[PDB]
Subunit: 76 residues, 6 copies
């Protein structure tokens, strides 16, 4: 049939930050204990897994701004 699809999303947006001095940041973890028991692990088809972790992060981006965009057009 005479199908017509026009797809023109427009994006002039901005994601912006101003920051002064960024600093004097202390991260001082006091250890710890982690234990995991399992018999069978059986992972299929798009699995993301963490088992038995003791992980420390210090993340100090001067910006850290995010712009996430998705477009999908499906025709049948």
């Amino acid at each position: 049939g005479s199908v017509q699809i026009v797809y023109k999303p427009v994006d002039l947006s901005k994601v912006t930050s101003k920051c002064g001095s960024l600093g004097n940041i202390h991260h001082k973890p006091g250890g710890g204990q982690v234990e995991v028991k399992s018999e069978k692990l059986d992972f299929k088809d798009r699995v993301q897994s963490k088992i038995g972790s003791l992980d420390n992060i210090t993340h100090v981006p001067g910006g850290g701004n995010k712009k996430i965009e998705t477009h999908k057009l499906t025709f049948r």
Copy 2:
């Protein structure tokens, strides 16, 4: 059939940061203990796995800005 698809997403967008001095950042973890028991590990078809981690990160990007974009067009 007479199908017509026009696909012109427009993106003038910006992801921006200004930062002053970035610094005086201390990350000082106090160790720890991790234990994991398993018998069978059986992973198939797009598996991402961490088992038994004791991991430390200091991440200090002057920007660290992200712009993630996805486009899909499906015709049937």
Copy 3:
């Protein structure tokens, strides 16, 4: 059939940072213990795996900005 697909995504976008002095960053881990027991490892078809890790990262990029873009066009 008389199918017509026009595909012209336009991207003038920018991902930008200004930073002053970047520095005086200290990362000082206090060791640790990790133990993992397993009998069978059986990995197939796009497996990403870490088993038994004691990992330290200091990542200090002056920018560290990311622009990630994906396009797919499927015609049947």
Copy 4:
């Protein structure tokens, strides 16, 4: 003067234990944090001191029996 002191304490005592199997003992501390601030420390004449400790003990003596005796005779 005609002072006479006789000092003959008699000790036939016993401190005794019987034990079977001694074992299957688990000590698993989960870390912690300790902080102390002080300006002047000024210790004189028989001082015993612990400042800022995070100490773990597992003590499993098969016996661990104690006999402590003091004798004093003083004459002026």
Copy 5:
């Protein structure tokens, strides 16, 4: 003067243990953090001191029995 002192403490005592199997003992500390600030430390005349400790002990003596005896005779 005609002072007479006789000092014959008698000790036939015993400190005794029997133990079977001694074992299957686990000591697994999860790290930790200790911090101490001081300006002036000024110690004199029989001082015993620990400052800022993160100490682990496993002590498994087959006996560990103690007999401690002190004798003093003083004449002024």
Copy 6:
């Protein structure tokens, strides 16, 4: 003057242990962090000091029995 002191402490005592198998002992510390700040250390006349320790001990003597005696006879 006609002072007489007789000093004959008698010690037939014993400190004794029997133990079976001694073993299967695990000591597994997960690290840690210790920090100490001081300007002046000023120690005189019989000082015992530990400053900033991260110390691990496994002590497994088959006996580990102690007999301690002090004698003093003083005449002034």
